[model samples]
Target: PPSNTPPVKPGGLPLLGHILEFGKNPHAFLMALRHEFGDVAEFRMFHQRMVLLTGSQASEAFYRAPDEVLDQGPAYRIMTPIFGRGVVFDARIERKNQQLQMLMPALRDKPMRTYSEIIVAEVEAMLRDWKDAGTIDLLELTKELTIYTSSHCLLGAEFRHELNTEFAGIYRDLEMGIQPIAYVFPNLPLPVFKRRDQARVRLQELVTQIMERRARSQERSTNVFQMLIDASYDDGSKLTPHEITGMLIATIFAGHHTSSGTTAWVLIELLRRPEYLRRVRAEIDALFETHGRVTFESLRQMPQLENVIKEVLRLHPPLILLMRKVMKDFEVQGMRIEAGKFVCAAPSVTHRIPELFPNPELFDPDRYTPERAEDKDLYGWQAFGGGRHKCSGNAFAMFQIKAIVCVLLRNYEFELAAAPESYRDDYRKMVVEPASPCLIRYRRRD
Candidate 1:
């Protein structure tokens, strides 16, 4: 019989199916699945059957496929509530390409110098208030820093000024609305949903105001928003204000919390591992002693911190699941995959496989050195994702995270003030973060 399906996890409960098992510990659950069923496995979340592809080989197949074969829009359609209309993912294929292409100018190399300047300023501003010694949730702290860096880089000074007060909460409402339950029942008629809707309108108004004000001023500016506002698509037509706003909103959710999460994890890992922490601290010492200040060029010079960042990325990928709807039928290991179903890849699970990564659980940054190069396997390093839809801001993320860590390390001494038990992953949110009250004790070293 050539019509075999992928091995399904047996004994799913009624109505809810495997959602409970998956919702409990998705990363560990996926790990158990691959060990039991090899590379590809299937499970149901209610009536929906999602094919889970584990490991580099299977995930390579998932990432490398053309969107026409494994399209992204439908699987992530849940984002529309916050993304609004005419965003790249919501647009038709040709329009989508044009919309995505508009982002290239802002992310390229020359602008990185300016970005680092903005980042350095933002990092110092956070330090200016100066607490001698106290406990703070690393997750919350990094998120505040994340907003300052991202909002300043993309939206410019005016938007950054607005965030000094209540506007930040409006943005939080949008981020909070991204719950897992949205997939099954998008119209949840809930408080969070109302907040998300309200935030979207207010956010839209703010972006339009920027566009209008910038137009009236007719002045030169340097920010991603200004670049987009002044840009013309390849056809020489301007993007509608709504298209620009929608894309900017999409940009915020994509990079903001993700970088903040990675930064918090990097700090936690270093605090726990004295071996790596000492080397990283030494690297930071050399970094500043030579250059005297952090910059884009100087950020590239810290191999130890870079390796530590790489290892942190491997252990904790920004997003847990990268899903795609099957636009065309495909087969894997003699299993039939239908057109209407979906395939999802989990980097958090793949990056933990001991075979691909020797002693995968260890927080060893040296694994990336040329002697090992454990991340060299195809599609093996997916912290920023892989293939066409790989994160557009990956370059931006790397520098922003490294700069924040480097600046903080050189200026402050931090210890893991929270219990070891509280250091686990919080799977409840769409983005994986260290569990709440992820406290760290800090004191100024400068």
Candidate 2:
């Protein structure tokens, strides 16, 4: 009950303070910590000190703190090797802002429309390969779908097949480097670490080759890769080849993991509940009946489906921890937190706080309907996070997931192949993926 400093949690063993517990099950550990410590709790992880902020009031303060006070760079530095140099995480604050601006065109209306079209097409192509009825791993399947759609939409047509199918394994190795240990030993002389570095170089070389080829061509494309290649800063300096590669790596990982993980959860949740699945299918059917195809406008017509995605996000946010490192001393809710300290808000915990979301464990998409909006509080449903640094590609992710769901619902009927508990979350991965072998048996609705 001290007013000067936040309440610190006990149960530390010399150097490791809750790091092992967190490494074991971050979602459960954080929820327990929040329940025990209330809104603001402090703990140390080895040498790094951290503050865990929960609930709407504290989340508002945490996210609203200006970048000058709480910087994302230190938390994201672990991604340097994967994202490469000169990208957002590795750049100065001003340069990072500039980089974000440069990425605007990719998420602009025109690009989003194009991306939606690509998403629908990719989902259709993926489903075409499936049999009438069989067991499928929803997580792996959605991963492929998102990678395919993101590659085509962001990297342009030349890389669609090359990166999506052939280079997927290499990209996976790069993604595996995003583990918590990466923050401590990013460049350890291990085999997996070596592969991560090798994959980075290989992807960079491939992007450089594509840029060179595009420069030689007559036709100009509007894809993100092309935009990055043609972009000039406010100071009129163009991004170097390495910079564009870094940016592409960053963009792909962001779009890939968030879209894939969320889509998998949406499918898993819908499969577990037949009535909700029926409602979503009906909405998709009505949209198709009215618009004739899954266009951008048609996608928006499925509000029930949108609510379903929101509920899934609320229950299973892909990123458990939205983290930042204190750059300058900042006061949050009268508590003074000093510089060089880590601060985080866990969406998985906050989104399910019983006070915020009654019956939070239930998979009820109706909670997001007009009469009962789940996001009345800005911090209530933070699937895409909040404030200035919120994910820029959030709209794109939603559009992509909705398009995929629409195609699936319209064409097939799905049922879970495993017990409900089998789909419990696997927190070991960088993105909080569902437990392994999240199988679903689907049949084409004749």
Candidate 3:
């Protein structure tokens, strides 16, 4: 049967195409298309053709697509080369999903609870390092802190205190080196390329050292590294050392990038909206007073903080667009999609829909409350993608967010040192970032 969707119209100069327009403002470009071109629009970018799915329904549909029809090829196209051939994302569907499930044990409720102290300890340590008004870029500072925290809470102490900083610096380079055009022409000679290559080599070697040292002894640590060390398949087979490294690498790649950016955003948003910050601080105080400490339970009790974080995610999803390849042809809202074409739903764009979120430009966390319940549906709040591929680290991610916020409020009072009004979005990297440096000063509360 023929599909029943309107043809996509190009919105750019005739010969020059939408290159400049799309590149100049990707987030808004697609957001407007959602309103005018329907939720999903089939179009061409340069020579290659694609579909831009922009609303909640399209987001939900893509999430629910069968693996054969909407597959992971586009994502793997970028990740596999960097992670190596046998990486988890490169594995067969069932096996890959099983591996993802296995990872949950590391960040599971019990283990996560155990790591709370480590997270708090490391965060306070970093905060203490922040003295008078040194020009601190919030992005750089948060990135450093996240790397260290991940090391201690997710990796271990000796390695955390020693190799973590060096590891993070090189990891940043490796990630920055994998932009859209990097796939077409990778850098092999420049300092950036050399540093990234060195990072990859050193990371594998470092993980191997940890694994070999562990193999010689039965004692274990509570980090994800140890969790992978102890995990076994249902059939009793153990992941190979290489497989173990790949799994850890995948998590580390995901673990630091988004969380760090989101953490920075939280601090900025709190500073930007003083009213929200007051409410958040009040909520934190109440939770801590009632519970005596910040825990998974206490974090959950602070509903306002949760909603604020959710609202921030809606406004600036760390990931701008999700990339997926159509495996077998499929129809969405009665439109046929061909196999092999790139089809993606932009969460950053979808979050702006008026039907879903009225006056979406305003920073109102209360919009997520029960009475409003705007983002209650399956596809509503897609800061974390929808369906099976939805972030497995949802709990862990929020735990870090809530914990960081609590510590900041308890220790200092920050006002907007730099108005967040002018922070431009960096479109160069895969994740959304402040176009300029984000800086704020803090003082010990009297």
Candidate 4:
């Protein structure tokens, strides 16, 4: 670790820098540095200097970077062609934060409740379609379920599920486009970049169709499509058609990645830990008994189920590093961070810090219990992140997860078609998705 306190540069190979080593297992590479360099360290990603922050206080400071000093646009440049330059992520820091605040109402309470109903209905609908199949690919199922739910609920039922293939191609590319590869050599005519281009067109096509339809109708709805349609900048500028395109793209980018990863982790965790699974199922059953099957309100009342979702997210955050450029100079952990520096926080590392969480890595949902309350207190569990940029659809995320799991437990039984030990985590993806062609066996309930 470099001796410099404010900016500790870990020396690396010239030209390539540490990109190859870091790319191999970026999480592990970052973990090794956190262990060696304490809370903060810097490394070269291609030619750019990335100041990475680990653990709690450092993460908080990083997420809270000011707009004027820290340019958030650099972190999201790859998204420009897909999301347009006016999207919240690409907007001025203050504008992005404002959009988050303005949009919060639709993601919470009433709107979330409506989405929860859609989720419960969607879960049961899937269960109804499945026969006593010998095996089921849950990762694939969850992806389908989520895409359907997002389109049906957020964009309205008109958007349909046909966009999945097209959106997926773009999503995959957009995801890859963010990697250090772009930083080293922008769009080297790589497959990922090309796919990203194609995906963006599909996304634009779908979003444009939705936008045009909304424009044709005078409907007043609380769905995300309506929110984007109804919303504007503080300066009272209406979002351009391309800006709306970016909004849906951002919406898909936000919901699909983490939600799928979290759902996959939860399913595996439940399968592996029978006792914990029983507790989770029991909680669901008890809630169902109280409310007579899974309603949106009833599902939300299942605290244990919520804890399970939280626990999974804590263990496997979708992304390793959240880079937020500072808009102003800020003081964090006795260090005055300059505005131009790229501050990154590692939630994957911070969640496991023993000081904040006892036996941190273990899949103990009880850590979220009132008696323990590790996640509540840690404040850095950051599965969905914190402050203004916390995931807008967080409540909806939990609702869908619990709804799916509950329906599965109530109606069917699945086993490790392959053992948990054999599951290959695809860390290369932006979201920690399972490797392709994995399977989970599902049988009708006895």
Tell me each candidate's TM-score: 0.95, 0.95, 0.91, 0.88
Candidate 4 has a TM-score of: 0.88
For every model shown, the clashing-pair count is: 0, 0, 0, 10
User: What TM-score number comes out for model 2?
Assistant: 0.95
**lDDT by residue for model 3 over 1-446, one digit each (tens)?**
66675357654666445657777877877776666788878666665556887777777778898777777645655555456555587788877777888888788677787677778777887777777434567787767777777767666775676775776675676676575554534333555656666666777787778788777877677888888778888779887766776677677778786888888888788887888988998888888789887776676667888888888888889887677888787888777777767788787887877778888788899987886645467686688887878887778788877887788778876665665687656765667877656777777755
28-106 per-residue lDDT for model 2 (tens digits): 8898888898888898888778898888988998889887888888677778878876677779889988888888767
**Candidate 2: residue pairs that collide:** none
lDDT, candidate 3, residue 205?
Answer: 81
Taken over the whole model, the C-alpha lDDT of each candidate is 0.82, 0.82, 0.74, 0.72
Which ranges of candidate 2 are over 4 A from the true structure? 1-3, 162-166, 186-188, 372-375
Across 138-162, the per-residue lDDT of candidate 4 in tens digits comes to 7888887777777677777665555
lDDT of model 1, residue 203: 75
Candidate 1: tens digits of C-alpha lDDT, residues 1-446: 36888888885788877888888888878887878988889887777778888877788888888878887887657777777765778788788878888887687676778989899889988798877888788999999999889988887888778544656887889878877667554665688889988988887787788788777897666788888887888889998767887788788778888999999999998998888889988888888888898878888777888888889888888688888888798886667888888799888888887788878888788887876655468677777778878888888888998899999988899998866545977876788888877888889886
